[model samples]
Target: SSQGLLGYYFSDLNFQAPMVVTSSTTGDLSIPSSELSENQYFQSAIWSGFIKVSDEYTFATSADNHVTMWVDDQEVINNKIRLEKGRLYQIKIQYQRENPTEKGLDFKLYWTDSQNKKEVISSDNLQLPELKQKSSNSRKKRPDRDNDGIPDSLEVEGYTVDVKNKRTFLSPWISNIHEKKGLTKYKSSPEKWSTASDPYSDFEKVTGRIDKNVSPEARHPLVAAYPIVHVDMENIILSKNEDSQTRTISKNTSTSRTHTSAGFSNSNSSTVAIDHSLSAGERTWAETMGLNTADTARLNANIRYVNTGTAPIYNVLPTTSLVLGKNQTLATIKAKENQLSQILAPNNYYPSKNLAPIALNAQDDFSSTPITMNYNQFLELEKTKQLRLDTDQVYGNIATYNFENGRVRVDTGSNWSEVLPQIQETTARIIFNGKDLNLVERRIAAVNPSDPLETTKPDMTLKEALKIAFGFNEPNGNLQYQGKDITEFDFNFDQQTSQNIKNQLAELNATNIYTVLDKIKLNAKMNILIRDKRFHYDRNNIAVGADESVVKEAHREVINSSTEGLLLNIDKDIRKILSGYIVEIEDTEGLKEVINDRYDMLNISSLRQDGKTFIDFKKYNDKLPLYISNPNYKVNVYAVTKENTIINPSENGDTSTNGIKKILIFSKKGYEI
Candidate 1:
């Protein structure tokens, strides 16, 4: 008989126990069997066995109605995946034939290999799972020491129940209540737990007291309880009281005229007698009304001043006689005095005295008599005399003569030719020498020639020269170049020269680079570390031991040392080190001792001979302050060798060994291994 799969048949679509069950030699259900209904039924089969070969295989199913398949409990549709040879995999197929017209079920399972060979899975490669009878010992009830109904095994692993105490049966829920109430007393009764007033309750009830009124009696009970009596008086009478007074009167009168009236009128009129008459009757009527009326009267009074001019002329002539007499007498006196003066004065008195001629002698001479010399003699005298000249004529030399009014006169008989020649020679020599001298030399000569020239030379290498020129030595004696401390010298070169130097260095260090084969070998080792659980792997299995003393102590140390953080940074550094080739550490013993001694605070034990150490990375992997993965341990294995060289066992490469004898593991302060 061929090894096959166990098949279950159901009349209904659902896989209930009240159905026909059978065995199949193959996974194909194209043929109708008596055990299965022709239509409106379901069929499910399970094939538990190992694959025949190690290769990627794709699975296919052909069914008229709904069909599904699962490999190792994973739902797949035409799934293609690599499976290892001799590894057992559970294959499940579920089918439903709902169409009534369909005469037979056409469910079939097919597989295609990497070579594109497609066929139904043969019975030889499929086998039914081995069945074992249930042991009676497994049916024994687990102990619940606290009688809380939960078994100790499950409670210890997942529920975190205290098997010794029944109160801790619902510890998580009770603890959550405590946290919600902000209570720290774990042993307190539920009723005693804090019923903290809700901060939002007052805000919610803000509108409740809007119109609420309280009576005064309700407000003050003492005043409301006490009472005061009222008294009323009916009627009463009283006598009147009064006081008398005396009076006296006196009268006096005096009168005087406070007004005086006076009137005066003056009028003068002159008219010709040819005018008309005045009415006397109207004037009498005006007087009867007591009105003072002016009468129109014609008064011919001729007060003529016609003869005033002749009369005034006569009187004036008579008055002038006395004055004229006095005037004439004064004039005669004056005339007589004049005549007397004329008589006394001489007629023609001409006073004339002849002046003698002024002698042309030395006493009258006031001219500046200058002694004249010939032009040639003047020139010769000027040449002989030492005339004052500007100091510029001698190249601003002030030492030759005294400076008077900023002008220097050459000393008498001084040799001008000799002084000019000496000054010109000295000036020419200074100019000629100054052209070759640097600033330091020139400054020294100008200030003090005896002073040493503190000059720097640009003859050394470029780096040293630049340092001496621009580098500032700090007070601590550190050389600062380009505003930074100069621990090393860097030089710039032309592009081609720099590139050539880089190429030469690359050629020199070519031995340090790994070849293709070497990379493959190293990557193989790397993959082993990545895939193997013993080396490096990720586990979602969290080992929560928050109650353990050692775990608590470890957490306390981590928090106290301020190292409670993610392992992301350490993972990055580790990735950098692992990205390169695996080299054997030369100082393995020293590294082991150092890590064991220094990292004892981390609870990392001593490394084994195989160079593998276990590290509790619980604090690193936790998402909370408390470690979720209690004993979350990881293996850190250092590459080592029995001998000095790292030897690749495979001999197919050009060289199976490299010069990488030592692998240096650098760690920072907080990120130590």
Candidate 2:
């Protein structure tokens, strides 16, 4: 049978009563509750697994009943057993419940590892082993319908061994266990399983079934939570060009619930300190997330309570997890919130009996530091490149006090039409002087001062942009053109006005530079993606229970960090709009300061659809102007539509989009010179 650990339920202490229904996880086996008789008193459990030793080890235990241990079929007594390391051996332990009503079986497994480190054995190393056959002398054994030698009763419960068909199917109970452990497919309709020589021939077959069912669609519930736009000093920007029908965000969610009200209730006002003693459990959570020391952030606060009483509670430590980017201030605030939530809650990390009634004030140091990019990494943008005369130095600096002028109404409702005219007009202005401007009006509202400057370039034709811009505004059945002060003209209107402006500008002849406006700078979007990944994680921890330190640590791992994989169909000709006079940051350190200042305080929140945290662009639009004014500017973001093997771009599926927000320029300072 592929059932779990072996269980033994005895009817009485004298070993006289019959036993039934074994399968204990923690060495405490009991009777079949429904079939249990009054005499059914004692219960015991057996665990079998191969323990590899490098040198020597000791296994010690204490119990009321006669506890037993075995290795390689050899039995040892006195509740203690030691084995020399350096070889593989099958280990086994049996615990007995002699008195049915004693209420305390009292079994503990303690081991001294090869290095002599004494501690309670963790369950990670223990595993449910294959059932070993026993030579029983029962002549009246129950009938095995399939003649598989297994008793008919056991066969029905663990599995259905079909001798006729030469197959074995997982029993209902076994499938039930699979479902409990997140192997969802196993619990599906007819019950998924595999054929084997014996019940547990290969655990891979069980897991393979699960892996086969993992979803591979782009619209994964895990990666759809992030959908925001950005633009930066590198002349890069995020845009969506397709139909605005984007999917709702979806992200992982969790909650904290535990069992410990009485044990922690009514205690004195004690202080608790947090420390970074978080073990990677052989590997630290930071390493598990593939973060380097420079990219790893941690907060460890060792809690110290003044336990002057006899309670053995001093060594108790609980694990906690936090998800954040490289912002120290935000990390500080977030870690404190998480830490307080963790230490202030009731937990079952330790048994209540071990904590004696003691009143003590608790206090300790708690510090969480953010991982940062290496100095050389930050200096990449600072490497000075000689600015080309006519090519790179497009549009010398404009002496404007500020370029943070004009604003567009962000329609999160995906109301693309409401701002279609504005988008089209903004598109044209970007082409005309390459000034990233947006000044269309109404239904979506604002900017009443009306900076009445129909700024346009003589060399560029604005007819196409205006055509596309007005078509969407054209009358439907009853709707008439409501465009204010705007002339509604034919597609052929206006080479005359544009040529005159160009000829007039040529007279000034101050050495104008040519550049692209709407197009994002080389690799700008790529760098932004990397920065987001390295600098961020969920602001709030997952909904795992408050007391589950180990589980919580795992929940906060960065393995779940991937961009939203929403594919967008963008038009290739949009680059035509960035042509005339335009320009594109600082030393990495200076750039970092600028970015920090721009996103001084980013507002991270869960998406409405799923709960994964994402930067809310609506709350932070000031980052644009800061990027626009910087000489080394290039900031671009792209909507993710496919899982990216970020470590390997070759495997990164196409990531495209239909909407975008960015800054183009008329002058170096992004002003209308």
Considering every candidate listed, which one attains the maximal lDDT?
1
List clash counts for every candidate, in order.
1, 55
- Residues 1-673 of candidate 2 have per-residue lDDT tens digits of 1222333333444323323433333322322333323333455544444444343566666553467777666865433355554444555666555454643233555667667786655533333332212212211111223322222333223322111121122222334444455321211101111111111111222211112211121011100001111000011111121143431111111111111111111112211111111111323222233434344222222222221111011111222222122221211111121122211111122113344321111133233343233333222211211000000101111111110111112213222123223322221221110111111110101111122211111111222222221222223322112432122211111243244334544654523211111111111000000001111111111011112232223223222221221112221212111111111123334441222111102122223334332333333333333334443433322211111111111223221111212232111112311
Evaluated against the true structure, the overall lDDT of model 2 is 0.24
Q: Candidate 1's residue-wise lDDT over 310-368, tens digit each?
A: 00010001000101111211000001111211111011100101212111111345551
Q: Which pairs clash (backbone N, Cα, C closer than 3 Å) in model 1?
A: 543-630
Candidates' TM-scores?
Answer: 0.19, 0.21
The parts of candidate 2 lying over 4 Å away from their true place are 1-42, 78-86, 102-106, 113-117, 130-152, 157-673
